[PDB]
Design goal:
part of a larger assembly, 2 chains, about 100 residues, little secondary structure, virus like particle, glycan
């Protein structure tokens, strides 16, 4: 209902955690689980490649259609670009329904 | 200077005329060329197929470009369509320079 593709077997969930690394344990055995750990965090890169199948438009319409276009008028800052502080922002929500087709 | 492709050997000129068909000549020889003709005109269809080579756009730009689009607002009559009397009209002159590229 929120849009998208309903899948019975969607991309699985990739779960990840940092393996615990205990701090120096007592020098005498204590049955209690170790609660002291070395503080750490991990970083790194992640890539995600998706192949999409398209269905090209074969419109035999005569007059021009409605395309999504960045309005030609001059602005302070380009749309879908970083401002003067390096903060990227998407100004409006873009849908897909632009091209028309008969019913 | 008016735009287009300058060609040294452009598509040739296809010339066409109706061959003359003289009206009934005198029954006695007159050296003068016949000036009386049967009034006629010809009609028919003509096709012209042209193959154009394209150069697809490979823009690696991030934000959206400026596309030519039929304005979404409601009008009395569709643009580039026939009016209520069957008269086709092109409302504005459309150029090609829409997509941008670096210098």
């Amino acid at each position: 209902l929120m849009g998208g593709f309903g899948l019975k077997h969607p991309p699985p969930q990739i779960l990840i955690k940092n393996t615990p690394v205990p701090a120096d344990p007592p020098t005498t055995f204590n049955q209690s689980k170790l609660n002291s750990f070395i503080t750490q965090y991990s970083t790194g890169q992640v890539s995600v490649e998706i192949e999409w199948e398209l269905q090209k438009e074969n419109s035999k319409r005569w007059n021009p259609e409605i395309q999504y276009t960045s309005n030609y008028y001059k602005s302070t800052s380009v749309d879908f670009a970083v401002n003067t502080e390096g903060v990227y922002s998407e100004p409006r929500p873009i849908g897909t329904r632009y091209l028309t087709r008969n019913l």
